[PDB]
């Protein structure tokens, strides 16, 4: 464990869980997703858990919070996973994000980023140089 990331996992969880049990369930996960404009059903939510859960309990707990913590950091350049994040980084569904739905995403997910903060992130993934982020750019940034 890195001191720099000594309690990051806790930081995120601190904003997800609510019932003080410290495990994000189906209904808990749903709200976070719903706040971004997405409104799916139980099958869509439970399917997500199965995406992380590997103990057969059907709920993301602590081990999965360490295992998938690495998995995703290695399985970043896969295929649809690049579209996945792009899907959670967009709301209007147009193909690109800027000082638009980005701010809304962070405020409803769990990341501090003021205008000048996201501005950095703009020139961070603005390969094409139009002051924006899109599929074509994110794919390259998501690995390089």
């Amino acid at each position: 464990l890195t001191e720099e990331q000594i309690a990051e996992f806790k930081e995120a969880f601190s904003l997800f869980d609510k019932d003080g049990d410290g495990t994000i369930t189906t209904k808990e996960l749903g709200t976070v997703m719903r706040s971004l404009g997405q409104n799916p059903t139980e099958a869509e939510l439970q399917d997500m858990i199965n995406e992380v859960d590997a103990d057969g309990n059907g709920t993301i707990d602590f081990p999965e919070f360490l295992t998938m913590m690495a998995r995703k950091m290695k399985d970043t350049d896969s295929e649809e996973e690049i579209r996945e994040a792009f899907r959670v980084f967009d709301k209007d569904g147009n193909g690109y994000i800027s000082a638009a739905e980005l701010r809304h995403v962070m405020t409803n997910l769990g990341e501090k980023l003021t205008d000048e903060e996201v501005d950095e992130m703009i020139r961070e993934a603005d390969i094409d140089g139009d002051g924006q982020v899109n599929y074509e750019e994110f794919v390259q940034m998501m690995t390089a």
């Binding site: 996960l29 995406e51 996945e84 994040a85 992130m121």
Partner: peptide
């Protein structure tokens, strides 16, 4: 879905410039 997107968000943020 939020747990993995969070990690990806961190990987997209933590590059060199911004933290």
């Amino acid at each position: 879905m939020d747990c993995l997107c969070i990690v990806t968000t961190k990987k997209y943020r933590y590059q060199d410039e911004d933290t």
